[PDB]
Amino acid sequence: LHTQVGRGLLGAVVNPLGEVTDKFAVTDNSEILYRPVDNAPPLYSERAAIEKPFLTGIKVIDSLLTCGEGQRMGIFASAGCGKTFLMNMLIEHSGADIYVIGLIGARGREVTETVDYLKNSEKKSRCVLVYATSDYSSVDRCNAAYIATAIAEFFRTEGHKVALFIDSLTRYARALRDVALAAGPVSVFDSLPRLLERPGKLKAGGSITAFYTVLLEDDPLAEEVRSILDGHIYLSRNLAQKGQFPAIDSLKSISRVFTQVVDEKHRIMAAAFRELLSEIEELRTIIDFGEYKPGENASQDKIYNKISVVESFLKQDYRLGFTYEQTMELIGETIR
């Protein structure tokens, strides 16, 4: 019902009970306070309009799926689509003040994997990890998401630019389902929308840019979640098996605040690049049909000789971060 917050949690690992069980960093700040995990979402007059971009350092996102400060973004992926590596890139190459990771229903190997990654991260001293392994009860798994969101909220009221990560909404939805089964004007199932409406940018405080991951089958929860959130990023298993990392299918992904966080020339270049991707796909299905010969259609040859530079722009090593100017420069070179 109440949990620890404060800068003293930076570099620490928190279990569903609110206590620190491990540390991936040490900080000279020992600020420890207590706040309720079940806080009311902000009033409509207390929120601000999403107008600033949340740069991620990832080219395809910053160029075609530009996130906003205070946005709630869905990350839809399958078994091996590089979702964990995508989250690692989001933490590593973005510019948030504080990161709060929430592993819901994960396995011990995955928790220790995230800890081992944070122990060698550059954002190491600015992260708080709240985990709940698959051993904990459903109540503990939901309380883990509530705890992470509460910590992120405290850091927001202090004016910090916070990035919250929830992995995943699927396993959290299962735990919430079991709790609802434990009960049979207040419904346990309502804890999912109320949880999703807590991030955002406050007029009197900082912001919480949230990334909720949703697992896909090799789903009604996924569709309603995509209806609640401010946009989604689709990680295609097809692209992942072709060697495309990040396996982001930008033609099946959207940011609902895109036109509000980028200017006009960015909009034009992004539209041109999306049309180029569409034409590239049409040429791909034409080639698969075996009806493409070099020399006949000059348009198909122009689009054909563009596949290399486009695929080169979409791909990005997980160790490299690109500034906004570099991203717009590269995408500008790609659509010539």
Curated annotation (Swiss-Prot):
Transmembrane segments: none
A single GO cellular-component term on record: cytoplasm
Subcellular location field: Cytoplasm
EC number: 7.4.2.8
Impact upon substituting residue 109 to E: Abolishes oligomerization. Lack of ATPase activity. Exhibits moderate invasion and hemolysis levels. Low levels of secreted IpaC
The keyword Translocase is assigned to this record: yes
Annotated consequence of substituting residue 216 to A: Decrease in ATPase activity
Residues that, per the record, bind ATP: 80-85
Record comment: activity regulation: Oligomerization increases ATPase activity. Monomeric forms exhibit low-level ATPase activity by forming short-lived oligomers with active site contributions from at least two protomers. In contrast, oligomers exhibit enhanced ATP hydrolysis rates that likely result from multiple preformed active sites within the oligomeric complex. Oligomerization is important for both enzyme activation and T3SS function.
Enzyme class: translocase
Impact when changing residue 81 to V: No change in ATPase activity
Variant or mutagenesis effect after changing residue 217 to A: Slight decrease in ATPase activity
UniProtKB keywords: ATP-binding, Cytoplasm, Nucleotide-binding, Plasmid, Protein transport, Translocase, Transport, Virulence
Record note on what altering residue 83 to A does: Lack of ATPase activity. Mutant is unable to form external MxiH/SctF needles and to restore the invasion phenotype in a knockout strain
A Gene Ontology biological process term: protein secretion by the type III secretion system
Stated consequence of mutating residue 109 to A: Abolishes oligomerization. Lack of ATPase activity. Abolishes invasion and hemolysis phenotype. Cannot secrete IpaC
Catalytic activity: ATP + H2O + cellular proteinSide 1 = ADP + phosphate + cellular proteinSide 2
Function: ATPase component of the type III secretion system (T3SS), also called injectisome, which is used to inject bacterial effector proteins into eukaryotic host cells. Acts as a molecular motor to provide the energy that is required for the export of proteins. Required for type III secretion apparatus (T3SA) formation, proper protein secretion, host cell invasion and virulence. May play a critical role in T3SS substrate recognition, disassembly of the effector/chaperone complex and unfolding of the effector in an ATP-dependent manner prior to secretion.
Domain remark text: The N-terminal domain is required for oligomerization and ATPase activity. The six N-terminal residues are necessary for proper oligomer formation, though their absence does not entirely preclude oligomerization. The extreme N-terminus is also required for interaction with MxiN/SctL. The N-terminal domain, not ATPase activity, is responsible for localization of Spa47/SctN to the injectisome. The binding of ATP induces a conformational change of a highly conserved luminal loop, facilitating ATP hydrolysis.
Family as reported in the entry's similarity comment: Belongs to the ATPase alpha/beta chains family. T3SS ATPase subfamily.
Subunit structure: The core secretion machinery of the T3SS is composed of approximately 20 different proteins, including cytoplasmic components, a base, an export apparatus and a needle. This subunit is part of the cytosolic complex. Forms homohexamers. Interacts directly with MxiN/SctL (stator protein) and Spa13/SctO (stalk protein). Can form a soluble complex with Spa33/SctQ, MxiN/SctL and MxiK/SctK.
Protein name according to UniProt: Type 3 secretion system ATPase
Source species: Shigella flexneri
Gene name as annotated: sctN
